Symmetry: D2
Subunit: 251 residues, 4 copies
């Protein structure tokens, strides 16, 4: 099929970090670096937008936590994106995202995003064929608007196996503290798994751009995922500084 | 030159309505019609955006007043657009407009607009060459986003002669009630008149689209201007209703 | 009764301005003065809040129009207050007013106000006995907060006879342009007229304060009403300037 | 002195939890309970406001983290309060807090608060004598407004010794990840320590009310502090449910 040579099928899900302590050392290393870059970001009038998509339970929440753990909370916002509330449905679909875009020197992090227009909204049919079919180009224009200006955009997709999802779904059910986090909605979405793959493959084809790359994170192991998120970010910020003459902190 | 066969040079500035009373009758006729359409707008989940550009003193303020005089104030907002305030300069240039776009069933009216990016911002150099050169396509995308959805957009440009501007500038100075309304800024802008023409011609070429037409209103006579504004609006709303199956009120 | 020696019963409804032209001269005189004070307001970090209450059709809308006709629209906002929308009902009742209070140097004008908590909300029972009974002191605290700071507050009540209301209700029905403006709600409220009087008398007793006076405007004649509104405003602004050392423009 | 029999001098700073594991068990116990109450909160149209004040480094940040760790992020906001930004200084001092108050069913958490008007603003003289002297009663009115409605308010003050502060200040300096978190401002404020005590004692006297109690948390040991925060919250929520007939989850 096309799903046999698709992006998600080609992903090596064996990736991992075996030692918990060598994880902690790498995290703290990358956390230090990211904080140093946050100071240069604040001064230099550059805004960062991070988009995080993926399967339910795939560890977007976990990754964001590690990205922001030791950042200054005054310099970042985390925006968790669900279904449009009734007040948002009265405006064009992008209006609610435009209100959340960071000011210069600031980071906004999207737990889900506008990409819902071509995922959940497509598969559940909340958006018509015409709406989701034109939306890829709308989303690209939106990204380019900001990147042609002084925004940096990074997009991450956390990929896990269907079997790993089930293991995590079961653990969220057994733990009382995590029992919110798993709902009938979560199970419904796993049932549509293969429709989602089709939709996610189209998204990687249509909306992976030089100014706004999709990064597919192998996420069966949370440790690898979290550390690779930090690594990719640090890298695309440094690349941006080097390109535009800004001076890096200890590189 | 190109300004000899430009849009603004071809405009017939002699247009007028001689009788004040035949003006009042036409206004009230079109005002009644527009109110009737406002009820259909509210119910039907359609949003209208009006953009008004033009020379200082050209009568945008006057036109808006006649458009909204007998409308329900709960169903429209008038947004007067000046230079970005310090808080707006911290975000991408379109963010402040996205916050002002109408909800469905509502009208927003822009006294100036995003088009400032390719007019004042160009001539005074607040926007670089790259910024204003790419902005025409950005503005077009923005308009099409909304028109591909459920927004109707109408753009009006109020054109007067340089001599008529001077007459109005002088009257605003003599009348104490109108003395705000004329500033050093106004005089500065008249000095750059021919740069503005060049910039306005480019705008009419680049951003006049089937879904979002520029309408050049002959405005040496305020009466004609005001009545032609109402006429054009009524028309493009009715056209939208006819196209999308909605039923008109007494047409 | 108490309504025989009430505030509204004592009001002389014969007040009028006989000559339309002597009205126009007085209006323009007071409009010039108010604009001059608006410049001193902007510079001096003082905010003005105007509250307008009254019967339906009593001319609040008309008065506001004359107050703002020749003011700079960048220095004032007019906020028309209806029943709380669903999104506002999720917060405490004053939260929606706190969002509308003017910044320093600016004027906000309330077409209705928080006073709805002790009028419509009382008579229609949208607010319990406890809620509206404690609300007078809450509203007083709110006013004093702002007046103890750098806000000036003026409150106006437009009083007309029951017979004058009916005449205006009939005219709004016959004129197509004014037919919005009269609804079943308007008729329902006239039926509760005497409950409203009781509620309005309590409000004048409980919430008329030195820092925030109620001004009962005789409004059977729109002309007198409009001109007396401007006169009272000009006066309480000038008084504020004199009290706090600010220098007036041509007094 | 008065500071010898003051609230903060009477506090027993020896309080602690010796075992890290018996801490983890208690935290998870109270975290489970709080989540269960969060579901009843959402359904029942009750809003919670938590205020957290205290010395720099006293563990407000730590406490909030434990309070919210296993809560649904869609049902709470954490608002970190610094000095007013230029845009906030254009409005009355409480306006920025009114924008942050939770909707019904939601929790807002203030890392600092309006109480800055009678602490930092007093000692550094950003607020005049008249301003901070009247502010205690203003703050009380504000709290009572919300408590007379359907808001629950809990206020926490995290108290540590001057010597413990120094130890933490030194640790924040040595750790690169925590080096933001300690600034010249932090050192300046420790120099004014005794002025702060005077100001905090006045605040506990003037603004500790039955509907809005101050809870002085012994915080030399972070573990005790965090667990006592959860305990107090769970308790004042349960008390509110019992008082108003709502049924508790497993009590």
């Amino acid at each position: 099929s096309h799903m046999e040579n698709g992006h998600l099928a080609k992903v090596d899900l064996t990736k991992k970090i075996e030692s918990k302590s060598k994880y902690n050392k790498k995290l703290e290393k990358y956390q230090r670096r990211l904080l140093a870059l946050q100071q240069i970001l604040k001064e230099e009038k550059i805004a960062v937008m991070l988009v995080m998509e993926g399967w339910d339970a795939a560890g977007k929440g976990g990754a964001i936590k590690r990205v922001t753990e030791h950042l200054d909370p005054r310099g970042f916002q985390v925006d968790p994106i669900g279904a449009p509330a009734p007040h948002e449905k009265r405006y064009h679909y992008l209006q609610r995202f435009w209100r959340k875009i960071p000011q210069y020197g600031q980071i906004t992090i999207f737990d889900r995003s506008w990409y819902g227009r071509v995922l959940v909204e497509r598969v559940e049919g909340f958006a018509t064929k015409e709406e989701w079919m034109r939306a890829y180009d709308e989303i690209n224009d939106f990204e380019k608007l900001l990147t042609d200006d002084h925004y940096i955009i990074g997009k991450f997709f956390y990929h896990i196996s269907k079997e790993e999802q089930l293991k995590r779904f079961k653990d969220r059910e057994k733990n009382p503290l995590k029992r919110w986090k798993i709902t009938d909605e979560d199970w419904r979405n796993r049932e549509k798994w293969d429709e989602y793959v089709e939709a996610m493959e189209d998204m990687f084809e249509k909306t992976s751009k030089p100014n706004a790359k999709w990064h597919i994170i192998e996420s069966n192991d949370k440790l690898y995922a979290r550390v690779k998120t930090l690594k990719i970010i640090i890298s695309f910020i440094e690349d941006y500084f080097l390109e535009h003459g800004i001076e890096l902190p200890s590189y």
